[PDB]
């Protein structure tokens, strides 16, 4: 499923992925850790640190600064275990709250971040963070759009229709942005 | 197959995401 590596990266940019600053928080150079789409096909633990810290920070702020206080940036190995045990438990809780909608989190996926098994966990993680923010930034009069999105529809015509509504909304709202900033 | 309706639901997700994100800022910007 190539689009899994695709939508992920797009969804990565959806959270506002800026490869520079998010590499700057770790105190390391970009040239030694490549970002983008073709970054987790092989074992790549640095890109793992970066994307996982950004993904955990985008969803939570205070508890994220708490559980990753004695870990990040995990430059050494004694403090690395702190990161690997603070992230695995959280991902296990998240997977248990959703269940079949998530791949079962295994600590072994964190010993070598790469291959399709890591990309699967990463895409479902990105989906979860998107959704739990569609749960908070969408209006109280529109929270159902979240659960309407959790409703796993199976027919293609309704999927077409839903995309259709959303894309006309997209066009109109981007047009209103121009009206507001210019007028 | 399912892979295409998942593509559709994902793109709907992204539309909804970015739209709400720019709405919450434009409402702030107009006031």
């Amino acid at each position: 499923l190539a689009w899994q590596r695709e939508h992920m990266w797009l969804a990565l940019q959806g959270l506002g992925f800026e490869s520079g600053a998010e590499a700057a928080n770790a105190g390391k150079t970009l040239v030694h850790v490549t970002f983008g789409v073709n970054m987790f096909d092989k074992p790549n633990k640095d890109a793992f640190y970066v994307v996982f810290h950004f993904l955990f920070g985008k969803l939570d702020n205070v508890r994220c600064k708490e559980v990753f206080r004695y870990c990040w940036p995990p430059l050494d190995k004694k403090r690395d275990a702190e990161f690997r045990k603070a992230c695995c438990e959280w991902l296990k809780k998240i997977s248990d709250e959703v269940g079949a909608g998530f791949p079962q989190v295994v600590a072994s996926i964190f010993l070598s971040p790469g291959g399709p098994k890591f990309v699967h966990l990463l895409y479902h993680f990105a989906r979860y963070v998107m959704l739990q923010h569609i749960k908070r930034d969408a209006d109280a009069g529109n929270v159902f759009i979240s659960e309407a999105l959790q409703s796993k529809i199976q027919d293609p015509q309704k999927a077409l229709a839903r995309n259709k509504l959303a894309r006309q909304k997209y066009l109109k709202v981007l047009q209103k942005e121009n009206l507001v900033i210019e007028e | 197959p399912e892979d295409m309706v998942e593509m559709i639901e994902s793109q709907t997700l992204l539309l909804t995401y970015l739209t709400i994100k720019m709405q919450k800022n434009l409402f702030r910007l107009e006031e």
């Binding site: 797009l10 940019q13 995309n163 894309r167 997209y170 066009l171 | 593509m7 559709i8 793109q11 970015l18």
Partner: peptide, 19 residues
């Protein structure tokens, strides 16, 4: 469906590039 897909993703990536 692929046409709406393409228009979608293109508008997504290009609007993301707006400052």
């Amino acid at each position: 469906v692929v046409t709406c897909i393409r228009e979608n993703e293109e508008l997504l990536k290009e609007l993301f590039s707006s400052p």
